[PDB]
A paper describes a structure:
The replisome that replicates the eukaryotic genome consists of at least three engines: the [name]-MCM-GINS ([name]) helicase that separates duplex DNA at the replication fork and two DNA polymerases, one on each strand, that replicate the unwound DNA. In these structures, Polε engages or disengages with the motor domains of the [name] by occupying two alternative positions, which closely correlate with the rotational movement of the single-stranded DNA around the MCM pore.
This analysis identified six conformational states of the replisome, referred to as States I-VI, which vary in both Polε stability (Conformers I-IV) and the location of leading-strand DNA lining the MCM pore. In this replisome structure, the [name] helicase serves as a core to assemble [name]-[name] onto the NTD face of the MCM ring at the [name]/4/7 side and the [name] homotrimer onto the interface of [name] and GINS while Polε associates with both GINS and the CTD face of the MCM ring at the [name]/5/3 side. In particular, a stable attachment of the leading-strand DNA to the CTD interface of [name]:5 is crucial for modulating the MCM ring into a conformation competent for Polε to dock. In State I, nucleotide binding can be found in five ATPase centers, except for [name]:7. It is noteworthy that three of them ([name]:2, [name]:5 and [name]:3) formed by DNA-engaging subunits are almost identical in a compact configuration with nucleotide bound. The remaining three ATPase centers ([name]:3, [name]:7 and [name]:4) are less compact with the elements for ATP hydrolysis (sensor 2, sensor 3 and arginine finger) shifted away from the nucleotide-binding motifs (walker A and walker B) in comparison to [name]:5.
Author numbering:
A (entry chain K): 15 to 34, 43 to 106, 117 to 274, 280 to 305, 329 to 405, 412 to 550, 556 to 606, 657 to 781
B (entry chain 2): 180 to 710, 738 to 868
C (entry chain 5): 20 to 106, 130 to 200, 205 to 213, 234 to 305, 319 to 517
The structure:
DNA sequence: CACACACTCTCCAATTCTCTAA
DNA sequence: TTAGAGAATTGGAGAGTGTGTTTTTTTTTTTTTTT
């Protein structure tokens, strides 16, 4: 009975505000706006119900009433700003935007959260997408042009002349930008209280019919940003950095770039050439597929017996097996219906924290061109200044930072410092000094301390937020060394204290997500190349790398060849290639896991024949087989020792791993 | 407290959701009650107050609410009803019950619920033009009824009893389209068998009629589409099989596994839950009229009937207003008017039964407007059926048996004379039907009952028709020098049935030709399609054109005829039986010698029946002497004018003494 | 519920015992006389039940299907009291009701009147063969052989074997009926068609399934007009909407006007006073003129035809000679003549006055519909005969109006049924010689 | 009816896990 | 850090409740419109 009364009040407020067909402000509009604000605030935190927002979304208040308020105020604001009760006509938009940011606030569910919040999270996440869907498509999304008025009114006055109260207005308006663009589809929380049936989840599309994946992607957000001029707003806000406009702004312009790769920026009928190439690749893989299918129908009945050792007469069907004995053996292998158990595992805005390499958001060519220059202009305007502004705050309240701050800060830092270096690599028009300002000693030691502290608390996500920056630390050290003593103080503290941390993560993180494993291989590849120009010892750092779990975690990445790219396979294979003659530690490489992956590599079903990956790999595997034959021919026990793991006995450790 | 303006500003995204809001529901109910209590038309009287008075007076249970009235005032409510009728009909039914309880307190004892029959829906569809966009919205399809199941009681409020643990389940509303689903019980989550409770359960009537696209509106040569129509309580048995009706109702769809299996696609089955039914069979020329019954009269209409009936010479006005756009032929018009009003069907002590309907035979030369008069009669009469010449078989005129394709047993279905029961049956080109087809209407035209004893079905249907047949003389021209029997191929048994036999002659008189040509040219000019809003301006133009030729309006003439037929039964108390006996004796004496028209006792009863029809025309409850002298004149004139020209003058001179005064 | 049931039983028992109009206990005497001739029933008038105690009538008319079995139990108890010396095996008596309530037209029986008592009139068009409904159902458990009994009331509410061993699990349905110890009663399905004078305008007559029971079976024959006092009940036959229910009437009293099966049940069921009245009538010296003057009194003249119609109605005397051949005793009359001479009115009157009569027109009548039609049973796929006009009118008169309009191949079928008075059928594997003494 | 299918109800030993082991 | 003693959980066979069939429209009459 309480819920339907709440619905009655929401409907009563809906018909009290007014409507169209020009929208009309009803009597006591401010009073009803304040009443709605008070009710929503009371039910949000004081009572923790999350039901008033639901009723508002139901009456389509945000679309039918709230948006037209700002749209109707926009023309009056333009007329007043071009002509040359303004306070009453200005304060009306304040409450509307305060309501908008409150409803657009992301919803977080944890164990401490009550059942109502988790129950309504799945029913309100779709409405969250609805809000951003209707906002972006509302006549070029001009509501953001009205939003920036709620900031330029306060920022216009002198910064030293700021207001102890009006200062919260800037935070409230700024939160709206980061809230609207952080809206992403949620997860279908399957009810796992009982065993699931012989069929899985039917539909994973968490989108209401009014919401389409076309109209909610970050491409739409970036197009709306460009068409609403707010690029100038974001540039001018950063141009006047010289506190409260730093923490929100850290993620206001980061959300749409939290997971967008920089490779799509440069291509390296224009879109149709890649279309033709992809058609060629899929034609090749389909051609490889049909090599197994019989020339005739399945019911042709091709039966055979393999005269296997012991004169066995095992019967396996299939005319395909009559072509090759290997096909018959594979049909023998996959005939078994028994399988083992494979164990498996975002609380913060989804991104690298949960995005596979192929999740490249489609961009319009014009939109891509605009976004290419927008971020470059931001870097040329205020990048290092913004970093130095938050350097002081980062040095304090180390234990007072919620896990959201690390994931929203470290990813931003690493992504932009990586983008600057790749942009400088592709084109020389950008100086390295534009990113060289991040080599400050205090910033480096603080970020390293955060990375090491995240290890002991089992905060794997926060630690993965740190490796992505640690890779670019070594990359930038190399870039500023080759293109050149400031780099020494940043790249000499990893002598004894930091070697354990970098040499332990690969041995333990192999039982987690793919990206966690991908971080460590890049770390090792970068660290093996930064020190090559000075060699504290080349033969000593590599000694701690040649360990069996390290080889296991490197070879576990190779099993995903159906999705590994040229560089992903290149780094993994080059790690073993660079130690073939420089280290000569191939004895630990003698597990069957690498041999079966080599068989998969050279097989046409794996790597592409026309590409430039399988040729050098095939030649190196040809040499690998020669090494295997030479080492196996000299030890009969090594024929079966190749399968079993190595031993801890003293004499055999040098007898087998080194051959006396 | 929302104004009508808020109702137009939907807050809930969906309309059904918008209507279901308690505040919006209360506002809509209040607005509809205000509309019912306060709507007044041009004449100033409250339409729905009188409608509710009539509803309660006859325990009608159904309130006929015109859609045009709902659209003119509070158009947002009309839009809501036309878009989401499922809930608007419930709200408006509750409002109608409240209004009736206002006029008739404690009416819930007579009828618990009052249904609303929306009439005059603007957008008329056909069973071919329905699409998915019409789902769960009011439609007004038109088609001919094909099948009709029996009136099976249907569960209204199912109150199941749990078998495992509980004993009471919620009074679920049956949707009349899909079976009620119980699923997990409330007393315990465990599932088991369920069955209804006979203690507190109410039933409603249920009939599933199968509409089929009318052969008139079907494109020529194409197969006709068809949809099943559910007739709920108070709507059952209102559409006879084979009749053509216009069905207003919600166009709903329900899922059935059989259809999905057959078609292989997740396709649904649609069905129309009828909200009102108007029959358009036998009045296909009556477009432009309003209401579910063209022949229903309001209290003011009845007062107007009683006011105009008291006029002296109302019979002449009614006769002159039969075929206003057909010049001359006053004898034919008189005969048609007498047939349209009919006589009183007697029944002596329950044993002897006398026919009470007048049969007319129009026999004459071509191009004398015999078929046009028949078409007019079809337009005017309440229940009229048109059948022509060879296109009417013996069993299609009266009754036929068929093996039911679904149940596989012999069933009896009526024909033209049953579909026109207590109406008129029009047989154009009477003389061109097969003899073994023409003889099939001998019983139904005198005994007024069709007797069928075929395929083990021994029954006697009832057909109180009134045949009006247009014939054509042998050779195409009526030879005045020969008797009637020599001009037609019909025999005495079929010629004696017709009370009035009008002989039409196409002669050449320059004055008559001039007058007829002037009338025809004037009528052709008047009927030209190129000859304060649009509706009442068009109505004013129609009345202006009508008043030129027809003294009494046609839309009022139809109601007048229906009122006289269904509410008047004149008696022959005050009469001079000696005059009728003398007339009959003279008729027989002159029939046997120098004549061929058969004069049996049927022609004696024809005088009484025609006198009763004339008394009906004046709405009188007693046959006056004038109404008897006029019937005698009609009968003797029809007898005389069918005689050969040699003896016609002598016969007229002999019979002049009975028609003294005119 | 035991206390209320016992109270109702005792109340109606006291109604049986105490009711008397003037010095004669009507229902005690009727019950004893019925028991004497092995007529285990009781024809209870409804005015008497209202006058005795209107509360009992209110209870009965509220929920008849639950109260009537109690009244039958009370009748059985009174029968044991007044026909058995204290210190059994007496069948449950049947209650036959007689009412004078306003007749509800057969088409007016709608959602309301369901489970109510309705009195209505119609003409029977079909009578099923006798079925067998169980009353005492001796029953035995399949596994543990726990024999028990079930008693059936046959007034369906709107019972089945128990779904329990009812005294190792024995399964869900452990009961099999013992057919050598059960007791059954005969039940017949009728089919009522509404009066031809009561059908609405332009509507076909409507049928209604009906059920008799015990002493109300074999009481009517097709074509007879009856008035029924029954319970307009509901049953869900599994033979096309949703939640639809096939309606039917459970008969509690039939009041024909033409006697029972056969004529007066092939014998004389004439009350003594009316038999004496007939004897007094037969001695009237002008009986011939009285009978002639009362045949279609509205038809002037036609004295000779009225006399011949009287002779036709009475008929001759049938003879069956020792050698086997029989001589028919029925009179056929043909009325030729000019139109308008009231032949059809005479035929229609004869269709009324005659106790058994069928009116048919020559035009709308076929040979297979006049004598006998071989029809295929929709369920069993087996051919069977359905009687025609000359079988319905058996023992009476069939009036064939418009005789000369019959097709030449249809009029021939009457040749045997008019003289030999038997209908010979050899179709679809059937070979029978029916009887038509019309 | 009963044999075969689909599937809810129900259940211990091999498979995983983290406290105490070497 | 290693070879080995302790907790802790849940999938794969099986007890069991309820299903689902076989199951049919031939051939023969009777009607009706054309032929
Ligand atoms: N002698 C008579 N007495 C009373 N009414 C009569 C008499 N003769 C004829 N009628 C009436 O005249 C009409 C005769 O119609 P019907 O008797 O049904 O037809 P019919 O006499 O059989 O002639 P058919 O059938 O066309 S050959 C009825 O309305 C009778 O009431
Ligand atoms: N008296 C008349 N007044 C007006 N029109 C007439 C008259 N007689 C005949 N007509 C015209 O003759 C036309 C044909 O008439 P029709 O229906 O063919 O008569 P029939 O079938 O007897 O030949 C009609 O359109 C009608 O308008
Ligand atoms: Mg014509
Ligand atoms: Mg006749
Ligand atoms: Zn329950
Ligand atoms: Zn048992």
């Amino acid at each position: 009975f309480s819920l339907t009364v709440l619905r009655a009040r929401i409907a009563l407020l809906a018909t009290a505000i007014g409507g169209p067909p020009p929208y009309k402000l009803g009597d006591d509009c401010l009073a009803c706006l304040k009443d709605l604000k008070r009710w929503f605030k009371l039910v949000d935190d004081q009572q923790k119900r999350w039901d008033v927002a639901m009723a508002v979304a139901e009456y389509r208040i945000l679309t039918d009433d709230l948006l037209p308020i700002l749209i109707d105020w926009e023309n009056k604001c333009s007329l007043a700003a071009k002509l040359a009760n303004k306070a009453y006509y200005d304060k009306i938009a304040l409450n509307c935007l305060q309501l908008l940011v409150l409803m657009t606030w992301p919803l977080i569910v944890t164990e401490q959260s009550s059942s109502n919040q988790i129950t309504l999270y799945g029913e309100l996440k779709k409405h969250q997408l609805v809000y951003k869907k209707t906002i972006l498509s509302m006549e070029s999304g001009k509501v953001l042009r009205a939003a920036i008025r709620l900031a330029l009114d306060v920022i216009k006055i002198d910064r030293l002349s700021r207001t102890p109260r009006d200062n919260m207005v800037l935070k409230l308006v700024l939160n709206f930008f980061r809230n609207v663009i952080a809206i992403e589809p949620g997860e279908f929380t399957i009810n796992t209280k009982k065993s699931m049936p012989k069929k899985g989840i039917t539909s994973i599309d968490t989108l209401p019919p009014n919401v389409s994946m076309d109209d909610i992607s970050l491409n739409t957000v970036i197009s709306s940003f460009h068409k609403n001029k707010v690029f100038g707003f974001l540039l001018t806000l950063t141009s006047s950095l010289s506190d409260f406009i730093n923490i929100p702004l850290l993620e206001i312009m980061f959300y749409f770039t939290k997971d967008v790769n920089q490779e799509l920026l440069f291509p390296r009928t224009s879109a149709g050439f890649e279309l033709s190439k992809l058609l060629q690749k899929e034609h090749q893989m389909r051609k490889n597929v049909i090599k197994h299918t019989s020339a005739r129908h399945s019911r042709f009945g091709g039966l055979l017996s393999i005269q296997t050792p012991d004169k066995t007469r095992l019967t396996v069907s299939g005319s395909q097996a009559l072509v090759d004995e290997k096909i018959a053996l594979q049909k023998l292998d996959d005939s078994k219906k028994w399988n083992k158990r494979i164990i498996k595992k975002e609380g913060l805005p989804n991104s690298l924290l949960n995005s596979q390499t192929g999740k490249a958001i489609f961009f319009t060519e014009s939109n891509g061109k605009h976004f290419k220059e927008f971020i470059n202009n931001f870097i040329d305007s205020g990048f290092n200044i913004l970093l130095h502004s938050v350097t002081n705050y980062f040095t304090t309240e180390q234990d007072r930072m919620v896990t959201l701050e690390q994931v929203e800060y470290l990813l931003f830092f690493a992504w932009f410092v990586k983008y600057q270096l790749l942009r400088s690599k592709i084109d020389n028009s950008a100086d390295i000094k534009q990113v060289s300002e991040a080599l400050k000693e205090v910033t480096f030691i603080l970020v390293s301390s955060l990375l090491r502290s995240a290890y002991d608390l089992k905060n794997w996500t926060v630690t993965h937020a740190g490796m992505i920056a640690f890779n670019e630390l070594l990359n930038l050290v190399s870039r500023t060394k080759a293109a050149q003593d400031i780099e020494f103080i940043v790249s000499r503290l990893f002598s004894d204290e930091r070697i354990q941390l970098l040499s332990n993560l690969p041995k333990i993180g192999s039982k987690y997500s793919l990206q966690f494993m991908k971080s460590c291989i890049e770390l090792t590849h970068s660290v093996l190349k930064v020190l090559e120009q000075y060699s504290v010892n080349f033969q000593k750092v590599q000694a701690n790398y040649m360990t069996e779990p390290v080889i296991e975690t490197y070879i576990n990445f190779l099993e995903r060849f159906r999705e590994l790219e040229d560089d992903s396979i290149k780094k993994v294979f080059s790690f073993f290639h660079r130690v073939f003659v420089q280290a000569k530690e191939q004895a630990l490489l003698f597990r069957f896991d690498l041999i079966i992956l080599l068989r998969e590599m050279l097989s046409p079903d794996g790597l592409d024949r026309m590409s430039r990956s399988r040729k050098y790999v095939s030649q190196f595997s040809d040499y690998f087989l020669a090494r295997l034959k030479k080492r196996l021919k000299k030890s009969p026990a090594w024929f079966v020792g190749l399968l079993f793991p190595p031993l801890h006995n003293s004499e055999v450790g040098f007898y087998q791993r080194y051959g006396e | 407290e929302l104004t009508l303006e808020s109702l137009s500003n939907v807050k809930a995204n969906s309309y059904s959701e918008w209507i279901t809001q308690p505040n919006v529901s209360r506002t809509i109910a209040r607005e509809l009650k205000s509309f019912l209590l306060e709507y007044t038309d041009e004449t100033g009287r409250s339409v729905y107050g009188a409608r509710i008075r009539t509803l309660g007076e006859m325990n009608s249970e159904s309130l006929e609410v015109n859609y045009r009235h709902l659209a003119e005032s509070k158009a947002i409510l009309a839009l809501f009803l036309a878009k989401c009728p499922e809930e608007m009909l419930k709200i408006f039914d509750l409002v109608a019950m409240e209004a009736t309880e206002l006029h008739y307190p404690d009416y819930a004892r007579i009828h618990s619920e009052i249904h609303v029959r929306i009439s005059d829906f603007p957008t008329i569809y056909s069973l071919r033009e329905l699409r998915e966009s019409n789902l769960s919205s009011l439609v007004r399809v038109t088609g001919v009824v094909t099948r009709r199941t029996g009136v099976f009681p249907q569960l209204k409020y199912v109150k199941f009893n749990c078998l495992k643990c509980g004993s009471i389940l919620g009074p679920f509303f049956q949707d009349s389209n899909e079976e009620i689903r119980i699923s997990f019980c409330t007393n315990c989550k465990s599932k088991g068998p369920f069955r209804v409770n006979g203690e507190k359960t109410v039933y409603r009537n249920y009939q599933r009629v199968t509409l089929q696209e009318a052969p008139g509106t079907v494109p020529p040569g194409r197969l006709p589409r068809h949809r099943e129509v559910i007739l709920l309580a108070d709507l059952v048995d209102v559409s006879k099989p084979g009749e053509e009706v216009e069905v207003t109702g919600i166009y709903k769809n329900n899922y059935d596994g059989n259809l999905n299996a057959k078609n292989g696609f997740p396709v649904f089955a649609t069905i129309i839950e009828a909200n009102s039914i108007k029959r358009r069979e036998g009045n296909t020329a009556n477009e432009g009229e309003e209401g579910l019954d063209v022949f229903s009269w309001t209290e003011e209409e009845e007062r107007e009937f009683r006011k105009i009936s008291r006029d002296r010479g109302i019979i002449d006005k009614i006769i002159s207003s039969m075929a206003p756009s057909i010049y001359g032929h006053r004898d034919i018009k008189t005969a048609v008017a007498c047939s349209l009003f009919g006589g009183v069907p007697k029944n002596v002590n329950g044993k002897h039964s006398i026919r009470g309907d007048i049969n007319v035979l129009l026999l004459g030369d071509p191009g004398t407007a015999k078929s046009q008069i028949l078409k007019y009669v079809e337009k005017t009469a309440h229940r009229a059926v048109f059948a022509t010449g060879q296109g009417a078989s013996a069993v299609g005129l009266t009754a036929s048996v068929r093996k039911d394709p679904i149940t596989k047993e012999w069933t009896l279905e009526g024909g033209a004379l049953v579909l026109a029961d207590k109406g008129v049956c029009l047989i154009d080109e009477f003389d061109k039907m097969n003899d073994q087809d023409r003889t099939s209407i001998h019983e139904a035209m005198e005994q007024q009952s069709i007797s069928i004893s075929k395929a083990g079905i021994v029954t006697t249907l009832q057909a109180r028709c009134s045949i009006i047949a247009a014939a054509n003389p042998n050779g195409g021209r009526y030879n005045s020098t020969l008797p009637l029997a020599q001009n037609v191929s019909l025999t005495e048994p079929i010629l004696s049935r017709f009370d009035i036999l009008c002989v039409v002659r196409d002669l050449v008189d320059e004055e008559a030709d001039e007058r007829l040509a002037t009338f025809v040219v004037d009528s052709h000019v008047r009927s030209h399609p190129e000859n304060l809003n649009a509706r009442q301006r068009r109505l004013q133009r129609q009345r202006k054109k009508e008043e030129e030729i027809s003294p009494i309006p046609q839309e009022l003439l139809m109601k007048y005829i229906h009122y006289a037929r269904t509410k008047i039964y004149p008696k022959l108390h005050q009469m001079d039986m000696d005059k009728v006996s003398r007339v009959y004796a003279d008729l027989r004496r002159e029939s046997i010698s120098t004549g061929s028209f058969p004069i049996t006792v049927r022609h004696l009863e024809s005088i009484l029946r025609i006198a009763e029809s004339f008394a009906k025309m004046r709405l009188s409850e007693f046959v006056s002497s004038y109404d008897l002298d006029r019937a005698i004149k009609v009968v003797v004139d029809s007898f005389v004018d069918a005689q050969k020209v040699s003896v016609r003058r002598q016969l007229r001179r002999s019979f002049a003494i009975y028609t003294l005064g005119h | 519920n035991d206390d209320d049931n016992t109270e109702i039983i005792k109340s109606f028992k006291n109604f049986i015992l105490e009711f008397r109009l003037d010095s004669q206990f009507i229902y005690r005497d009727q019950l004893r006389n019925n028991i004497l001739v092995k007529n285990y029933s009781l024809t209870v008038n409804m005015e008497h039940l209202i006058g005795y105690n209107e509360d009992i009538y209110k209870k009965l008319s509220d929920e008849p299907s639950d109260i009537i079995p109690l009244f039958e139990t009370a009748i059985t108890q009174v029968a044991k009291r007044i026909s058995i010396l204290s210190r059994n095996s007496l069948p449950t008596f049947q209650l036959i009701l007689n009412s004078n309530a306003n007749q509800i037209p057969l088409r007016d029986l709608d959602s309301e009147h369901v489970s109510k008592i309705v009195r209505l009139s119609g003409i029977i068009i079909s009578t099923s063969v006798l079925s067998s409904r169980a009353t005492y159902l001796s029953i035995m458990c399949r596994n543990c052989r726990h024999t028990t009994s079930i008693t059936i009331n046959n007034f369906n509410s709107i019972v089945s074997l128990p779904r329990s061993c009812l005294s190792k699990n024995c399964g869900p349905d452990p009961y099999i009926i013992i057919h050598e110890s059960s007791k059954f009663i005969d039940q017949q399905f009728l089919k009522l068609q509404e009066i031809p004078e009561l059908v609405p305008v332009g509507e076909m007559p409507r049928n209604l399934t009906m059920t008799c029971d015990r002493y109300l079976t074999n009481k009517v024959i097709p074509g007879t007009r009856v008035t029924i006092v029954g319970i307009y009940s509901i049953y869900n036959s599994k033979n096309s909407g949703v939640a639809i229910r096939t309606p039917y009437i459970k008969i509690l009293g039939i009041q024909s006007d033409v006697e029972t099966s056969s004529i007066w049940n092939s014998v004389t069921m004439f009350t003594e006073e009316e038999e004496e009245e007939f004897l007094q009538l037969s001695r009237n010296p002008k009986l011939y003129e009285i009978l002639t003057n009362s045949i279609a009194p509205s038809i002037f003249g036609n004295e000779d035809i009225k006399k011949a119609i009287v002779c036709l109605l009475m008929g001759g005397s049938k003879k069956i000679l020792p050698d086997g051949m029989r001589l028919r005793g029925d009179i056929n009359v043909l009325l030729l003549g000019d139109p308008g001479t009231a032949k059809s009115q005479l035929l229609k009157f004869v269709e009324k006055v005659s106790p058994i009569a069928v009116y048919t027109s020559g035009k709308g009548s076929s040979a297979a519909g006049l004598t006998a039609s071989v029809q295929r049973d929709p369920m069993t796929r087996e051919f069977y005969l359905e009687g025609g006009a000359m079988v319905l009118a058996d023992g009476g008169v069939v009036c064939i109006d418009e005789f000369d309009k019959m097709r030449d191949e249809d009029r021939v079928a009457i040749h045997e049924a008019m003289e030999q008075q038997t209908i010979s059928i050899a179709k679809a594997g059937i070979t029978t010689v029916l009887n038509s003494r019309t």
